[PDB]
C-alpha cells in the first residue's frame, strides 16, 4: 500500500494532538515548503463522519487574511480511515502562550492589544458574513503566522468552557451570537494580564458574570462597555461583529514596531 503522506512529504515533527486528530509539521518534497498537516482518524459513528466530511468541504472554500490558509485534503485507508488536511504552518506559540509571556501591564499596551483583537473580530465577521460561525473561539484556537498575522481556526492541539456562551454550556440551541460572547472575554483577557492561573480563572469567571476589576473599568472605560455588551446573557442583546469592528477604539491604531 502506498501512503500519499509518506510519499509526498518528509515528516519534521509532531506539533500536537486533540479530538480525532494528530498534527505534524512536514515538508512537501516537490514544492520544498513546510506545512502543518492534521491527520484525523474518521470516527466509527456515521453522523460524526458526516460532520467531518462537511467541515472539510466548508473550510476549503474559505479565504481571509485572518483565517488559517488551506492547501489540500485527502483520504487514506491503510490495510481505519484517515483524513489529512494540509494548511499553512503557524508559529508554535499561540495567543494563550503569547499572553502567558506578557504578564505585566507594560507588555499589554492598549494599541497592540486592540490591533490583535481587531484581527480576531475581523476573522469572526468574515465567518458570519458567509453564514458560518466558529462555536469554539478561544486563545488556544488563535495562532500567528511567521510574520505575526493573527490566524483563527480549529487547531485541536490539546495541552475549557471559560470562553463558551451560556446557551452552549446549557446544551441549548444557539446562533452566531455565541462567537460574540467568546470575543468579549478575549478582549478583556488581552487587556488584563495575569500572574497566576488561579488569578486568571477567578477573574475570567467573574467577568463572565459581568463583575470586573475596578482598575480595568477605570483604565479602559470604552472597552469595558464593549465587553459588557458582548457578554450579554441574552444573545439578541450582543452586538454583531461588524458593529464591534466599526467601534471608534479601533481607529488609527499604531505602536512602535507596527508593520508599515
Ligand atoms: C504549531 N503550528 C501550527 N500551525 C497550524 C496550522 C494549521 C493547523 C490546522 C490544520 C493542519 C488543519 C485544520 C485546521 C483547522 O483550523 C480546522 C477547521 C477550521 C478552519 C478554518 C476556520 C475554522 C475551522 N476545521 C473546520 N477543521 C475541522 C475539520 C474536520 C472536522 C472538524 C474540524 C479543522 O481542522 C488547522 N488549524 C494546525 C496547526 S499547528
- The CB of 90 under 6 Å from ligand 1? The reply is yes
19 and 117 fall within a common domain? no
DSSP sequence for 145-194: -TT--EEE---------TTS-HHHHTT----THHHHHHHHHHHHHHHS--
DSSP sequence for 62-123: ---TTB--EEEEEEE-----EEEEEEEPPPS--HHHHHHT--SGGGS-HHHHHHHHHHHHHH
Report which of 123, 136, 253 is spatially closest to residue 185, judged by C-alpha positions: 136
Experimental method reported for this structure: X-ray
Compute the distance between CA of residue 260 and CA of residue 247 in angstroms, rounded to an integer: 22
20 and 69 fall within a common domain? yes
Ligand 1 mean position, distance from CA 154 (Å): 5
| Model resolution, angstroms | 1.9
Among 35, 56, 59, 151, say which to mutate for ligand 1: greatest number of ligand atoms within 8 Å of CB.
Answer: 59
125 and 60 fall within a common domain? no
Among 38, 55, 126, say which to mutate for ligand 1: greatest number of ligand atoms within 8 Å of CB.
Answer: 38
215 and 122 fall within a common domain? yes
What would the grid cell of residue 85 be? 488536511
The answer to whether 8 touches 35, Cβ cutoff 8 Å, is no
- The CB of 133 under 6 Å from ligand 1? The reply is no
Q: What angle do CA 100, 37, 128 make, to 5 degrees?
A: 70
Compute the distance between CA of residue 209 and CA of residue 188 in angstroms, rounded to an integer: 13
H/E stretch holding 14 reads strand 9-18
Report which of 103, 67, 92, 81 is spatially closest to residue 190, judged by C-alpha positions: 103
CATH number at residue 63: 3.30.200.20
**Final residue belonging to a domain, choices 74, 89, 104:** 89
Residues sharing a CB contact under 8 Å with residue 84, sequence separation 6 or more, in sequence order: 4, 5, 37, 38, 39, 40, 72, 73, 74, 75, 76
Among 23, 96, 119, 132, say which to mutate for ligand 1: greatest number of ligand atoms within 8 Å of CB.
Answer: 23
Neighbours of 145 (CB within 10 A): 15
Question: Which ligand 1 atom is the nearest neighbour of the CA of 21?
Answer: 35
- The CB of 191 under 6 Å from ligand 1? The reply is no
169 and 240 fall within a common domain? yes
112 and 33 fall within a common domain? no
* Domain range enclosing 115: 90-260
Ligand 1 mean position, distance from CA 183 (Å): 19
Compute the distance between CA of residue 208 and CA of residue 212 in angstroms, rounded to an integer: 9
- Into how many domains does the chain fold? 2
- The CB of 95 under 6 Å from ligand 1? The reply is no
65 and 109 fall within a common domain? no
**Final residue belonging to a domain, choices 89, 122, 138:** 89
140 and 82 fall within a common domain? no
* 53 φ/ψ angles, rounded to the nearest 5 degrees: -65, -40
- The CB of 38 under 6 Å from ligand 1? The reply is yes
142 and 25 fall within a common domain? no
**Final residue belonging to a domain, choices 89, 112, 131:** 89
105 and 27 fall within a common domain? no
- The CB of 253 under 6 Å from ligand 1? The reply is no
3-class secondary-structure state, position 259: coil
Amino acid at each position: 500500500y502506498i501512503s500519499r503522506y509518506l510519499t509526498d512529504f518528509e515528516p519534521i515533527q509532531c506539533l500536537g494532538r486533540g479530538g480525532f486528530g494528530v498534527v505534524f509539521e512536514a515538508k512537501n518534497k516537490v514544492d520544498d515548503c513546510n506545512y502543518a498537516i492534521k491527520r484525523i482518524r474518521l470516527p466509527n459513528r456515521e453522523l460524526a463522519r458526516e460532520k467531518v466530511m462537511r467541515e472539510v468541504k466548508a473550510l476549503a472554500k474559505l479565504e481571509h487574511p485572518g483565517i488559517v490558509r488551506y492547501f489540500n485534503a485527502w483520504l487514506e485507508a491503510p490495510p481505519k480511515v484517515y483524513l489529512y488536511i494540509q494548511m499553512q504552518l503557524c508559529r508554535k506559540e499561540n495567543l494563550k502562550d503569547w499572553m502567558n509571556g506578557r504578564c505585566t501591564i507594560e507588555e499589554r499596551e492598549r494599541s497592540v492589544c486592540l490591533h490583535i483583537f481587531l484581527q480576531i473580530a475581523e476573522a469572526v465577521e468574515f465567518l458570519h458574513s458567509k453564514g458560518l460561525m466558529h462555536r469554539n473561539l478561544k486563545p488556544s484556537n488563535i495562532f500567528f503566522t511567521m510574520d505575526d498575522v493573527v490566524k483563527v481556526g480549529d487547531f485541536g492541539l490539546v495541552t475549557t468552557k471559560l470562553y463558551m456562551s451560556p446557551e452552549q454550556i446549557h446544551g441549548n440551541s444557539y446562533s452566531h451570537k455565541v462567537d460574540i460572547f467568546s470575543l468579549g472575554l478575549i478582549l478583556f483577557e488581552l487587556l488584563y494580564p495575569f500572574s497566576t492561573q488561579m488569578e486568571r480563572v477567578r477573574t475570567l469567571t467573574d467577568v463572565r458574570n459581568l463583575k470586573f476589576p475596578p482598575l480595568f473599568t477605570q483604565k479602559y472605560p470604552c472597552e469595558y462597555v464593549m465587553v459588557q455588551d458582548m457578554l450579554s446573557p441574552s444573545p439578541m442583546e450582543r452586538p454583531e461583529a461588524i458593529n464591534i469592528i466599526e467601534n471608534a477604539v479601533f481607529e488609527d491604531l499604531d505602536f512602535p514596531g507596527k508593520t508599515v
